[PDB]
Nucleic acid binder design. Structure first.
Ligand SMILES: CCN1C[C@H](C)n2c(c(O)c3c(=O)n(Cc4ccc(F)c(Cl)c4)nc(C(=O)NC)c32)C1=O
Ligand SMILES: CCN1C[C@H](C)n2c(c(O)c3c(=O)n(Cc4ccc(F)c(Cl)c4)nc(C(=O)NC)c32)C1=O
Ligand SMILES: [Mg+2]
Ligand SMILES: [Mg+2]
Ligand SMILES: [Mg+2]
Ligand SMILES: [Mg+2]
Ligand SMILES: [N+]
Ligand SMILES: [N+]
Ligand SMILES: [Zn+2]
Ligand SMILES: [Zn+2]
Lengths: 368, 184, 368, 184
DNA sequence: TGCGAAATTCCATGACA
DNA sequence: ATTGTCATGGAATTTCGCA
DNA sequence: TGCGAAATTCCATGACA
DNA sequence: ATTGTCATGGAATTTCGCA
């Protein structure tokens, strides 16, 4: 503070203050003759209050805060004192946007067998049809085979009814879903435990995690659309036709229909493939097991130039899920406990609870 | 002659009347010829309509080349014929009073009648909910003639519900006397 | 049709049908022994009905339609007949998504003088504050200087009141706005004509065109947010503070505040810049005119690898603006009349009206 | 001594009572010293409150280093002093009964009184709407002493509304007899 | 005429419904 | 008959201070 | 052993609120 | 305590038919 600035006035050298400039007194304030003009050097004990005043004018970031300060003052390492404040402004940290991209997506292994993993999810509300408003969509991970059930609500009770009808055919090892109320209810958990089905949940508000079923929605709605052009939206009667149409549609990258991957042979549907007519069932099922293992699998894409990836103990912030008008889009900072994989982490929130969260719903808190 | 395949032939048939269960009285029974895989649908009547409604659910999953039935009214109706023609399904009838299937189908169909009877005693009214577990049992049941369950023949994999407990399927002395009480 | 297939059966050569394969008759149908197995060759007169049946199963694109057909049939140039049908399926064309990117954005010249062009737009509804629900935002193109007016509705009448207050200071040559009802009303047109202001309109549903004002929204709301943290959303009293705070904030790329670009000198606000204290007003205004012409101007970014750019007479489709549930996202095809610039076109719609439209709200109709 | 700049000094002052216009009776007059640029605000009273309300609109655009006024009550109040101190504005008063400004400001202030009077005759009640056009006129009016209008001094550019028609600003014989009718 | 560190500039990211 | 924009905050690059 | 054209594969784009 | 996906339709590349 006032000590440092005395030594300086009487020609002595202090670290940080370059000796080739003339430091004087005027109007009771230590000044200096810089290329840009003459600036005041406030005492160290003053500098924090100055930065804070500058930053608070509009809650500006680094440079815009610096430019205000530099109008009146100079001292060594100004930006370090600016950055220090930005890291401590709660309002800026919970309001500003991130400018770092997530690391590249994972492409999880295709489940190995039909019925290993089910991906489920609701679409809706749709326009009322026969008193129905939603659709339960179930997608077998390995085959893409899809089951569609109309419901009046995205409820547990309607999910149970529907899954009882489906599980009649086979029971799956795992059912993966998002955290919609229907799937997280204890009534649902009991229903699963009863049947030896393990429930797996997506990180919250991250539908890419349910990507397998999510992507099917687009085809479902797209086909419903084409069929209903010029007519009123009576979709209920179409669900069966849609289901069947899709399950028997070829995926150009795979060269198989989801039905084919499920059964190894077309049923009595138009343009059914006849390539295995001369094989025994057993020969057919052998060639099927072969097809199932040699299906195309996409690899992780290249990282973008400015991606970040989580480290244990790092300060990070969770995205607010449904932010109200004029309210911050980010939660207070939290700490990374475990890095489950490069795109998933467990955080301790300040409350402090443990939460498993997608990297996409995080930013690394700025300025350390 | 090309070897038998799934979806080559569905054997369909009705079972009932039964004691009312959630207002349902019959069961449409569908068995795949080649695999012995079995679908069950509860109906309120053995009518062409309940049959069409039911097979519409099944045929949105898999379509048979041939449906085979006896000469029950529901199946011989001209409505049911139209339905089948619309879908390119050939209909096949067994001669009256002389029902032919295959050994596999006759045996399966027997297991169903026997398995139902076993669980409908002590709770003749709660079968509607049991249908899912009946089918799972039936389709994960080991075949003497082939090495494989219907599940394995349909999907080419082991099931996650192996019914490794082959059951009595016989009525115990407790259940025999209780069933003769219900008739009374 | 039946003619062609006769010549073929008796060993003769027809163009398209490779001579090294054995073409026979069986079950009353012309067949061929292809590497993949034995396929039927339908007569030309049949082929269209076959393609249509295949396509209609699920309204599939090229390859997935081909794969069904190839299960039963072979004939020369199958995909040409497949593509022909896809181009004529009205349902597919108005429903499917585009897979071509727009060409790279334009970066229009910064208006040359304060008051050359005004960009305006509404934000809202916001939470009620003092009975107010919207904000009129006015941004001078050259300076970024911003005026904020609270309103009860995004109406012409409130726009007029507000602009009368502002135009008190100066009249602008042009006012650019989107096509919100408030700005397109004849009452508004009269108000502009009266004052010699020319109205310029953004292409519809393309807020990038109002980018100058749009971008200011984000700063406005962001600052409102930081200020209202932990308090109820009483924003009305803050508009003046926000306006002032922003207009005097430095843009790091420009190194000037919008106020500075407007006036050439800071007013009595904190950290005011004192660099021109010794210049006359006239000297100051001279250095200002200099600053104004040498401001950074960004250039057009590189095109993405799969961009398209409009050509006169091309079939294109306009995006449906507010598509209802299960209804096509695209209008029927229309024709490009004029190419106003590489990112803007005039189209004749089928009704047929003339419409000036953003390239971003277009796709080039597929399959010609 | 450093040269005079915009925002160095705002000369503020009230004009009225006037005939009611949309319930307004006065005009706060703000003139920038250096440029002669003029802001006008309609008020319902020459009170500290209406003054603060008004200058709050102005000071969200530009803040003066010095406000100069006469010793009107509104400006000498201790509320008004607090307001000014909050904003780092130095207050300046002219001695009682001896109002000093600058030549530029006195002349401008005269043009306002004269220009208002000209348009308030024949429509003494519709001035509220005219304020915008009054200011445009005043700020795009050529200065004899400098080569430039206030607009040009404030912004360093030509205006898009040049008032190239210098006006009579004098009352015609028609308006003189009509104004002496309104007083009656 | 070259070092280490501070200052400045670069620029991808995201958000204006 | 028109058209994206620009705060942000680590990284890259340039300039500074000193020799 | 090399040509022109057809077939197949590649893969960016967009959309599942 | 978990994780994007895949139809689409021009362009790029490979294979076909023939010599
Ligand atoms: C309440 C439980 N819950 C949480 C959120 C509401 N959610 C749920 C969904 O089913 C979806 C959904 O399908 N999409 C569409 C979408 C958008 C981008 C994509 F990449 C993909 Cl794959 C899908 N978005 C959301 C969402 O998170 N919006 C912000 C969503 C859900 O059930
Ligand atoms: C009714 C007249 N009308 C038409 C549409 C409704 N619109 C109007 C707006 O002011 C906005 C707006 O601010 N944003 C936010 C936004 C989104 C992406 C961007 F790049 C940018 Cl720059 C801005 N979006 C839309 C819109 O078109 N949503 C689909 C929008 C408007 O007034
Ligand atoms: Mg969901
Ligand atoms: Mg979803
Ligand atoms: Mg708008
Ligand atoms: Mg907008
Ligand atoms: N995995
Ligand atoms: N331009
Ligand atoms: Zn802040
Ligand atoms: Zn189609």
């Amino acid at each position: 503070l006032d000590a440092e600035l005395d030594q300086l006035l009487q020609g002595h050298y202090i670290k940080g203050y370059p000796k080739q400039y003339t430091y004087f007194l005027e109007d009771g304030k230590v000044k200096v003759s810089r290329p840009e003009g003459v600036k005041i050097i406030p005492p160290q004990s003053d500098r924090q209050k100055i930065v804070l005043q500058a930053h608070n004018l509009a809650h500006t970031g680094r440079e815009a805060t610096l430019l205000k300060i530099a109008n009146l003052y100079w001292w060594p390492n100004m930006r370090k004192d600016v950055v220090k404040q930005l890291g401590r402004c709660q309002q800026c940290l919970i309001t500003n946007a991130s400018n770092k991209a997530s690391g590249p997506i994972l492409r999880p292994d295709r489940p190995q067998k039909p019925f290993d993993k089910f991906f489920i999810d609701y679409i809706g509300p749709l326009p009322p049809s026969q008193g129905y408003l939603y659709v339960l969509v179930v997608v077998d991970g390995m085959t893409g085979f899809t089951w569609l059930y109309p419901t009046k609500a995205p409820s547990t009770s309607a999910t149970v009814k529907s899954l009882n009808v489906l599980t009649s055919i086979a029971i799956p090892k795992v059912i993966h879903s998002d955290q919609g109320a229907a799937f997280t209810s204890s009534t649902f958990a009991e229903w699963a435990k009863e049947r030896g089905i393990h429930l797996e949940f997506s990180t919250p508000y991250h539908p890419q995690s349910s990507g397998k079923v999510e992507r099917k929605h687009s085809d479902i709605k797209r086909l419903l659309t084409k069929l209903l052009v010029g007519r009123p939206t009576k979709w209920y009667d179409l669900l069966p036709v849609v289901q069947l149409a899709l399950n028997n549609t070829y995926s150009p990258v795979l060269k198989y229909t989801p039905h084919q991957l499920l059964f190894g042979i077309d049923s009595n549907t138009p343009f059914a493939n006849q390539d295995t007519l001369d094989l025994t069932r057993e020969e057919e099922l052998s060639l099927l097991q072969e097809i199932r293992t040699s299906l195309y699998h996409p690899s992780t894409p290249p990282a973008s130039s400015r991606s970040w990836s989580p480290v244990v103990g790092q300060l990070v912030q969770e995205r607010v899920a449904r932010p109200a008008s004029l309210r911050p889009r980010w939660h207070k900072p939290s700490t990374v406990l475990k890095v489950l994989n490069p795109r998933t982490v467990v955080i301790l929130d300040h409350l402090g609870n443990n939460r498993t969260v997608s990297i996409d719903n995080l930013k690394p808190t700025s300025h350390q | 002659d090309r070897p038998q395949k799934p979806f080559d032939k569905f054997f369909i048939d009705y079972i009932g009347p039964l004691p009312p269960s959630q207002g349902y009285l019959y069961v449409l029974v569908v068995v795949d010829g080649m695999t012995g895989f079995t679908w069950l649908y509860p109906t309120k009547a053995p009518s062409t309509s309940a049959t069409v409604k039911s097979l519409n659910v099944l045929t949105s999953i898999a379509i048979p080349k041939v449906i085979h039935s006896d000469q029950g009214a529901a199946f011989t109706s001209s409505t049911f014929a139209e339905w089948a023609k619309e879908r390119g399904i050939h209909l096949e009838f067994s001669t009256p009073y002389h029902p032919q299937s295959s050994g596999k189908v006759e045996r399966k169909h027997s297991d169903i009648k026997r398995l139902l009877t076993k669980l409908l005693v002590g709770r003749p009214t709660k079968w509607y909910d049991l249908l899912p577990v009946v089918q799972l049992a039936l389709n994960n049941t080991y075949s003497p003639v082939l090495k494989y369950t219907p599940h394995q023949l349909l999907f080419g994999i082991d099931s996650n519900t192996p019914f490794a407990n082959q059951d009595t399927l016989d009525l115990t002395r407790e259940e025999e006397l209780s069933l003769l009480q219900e008739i009374r």
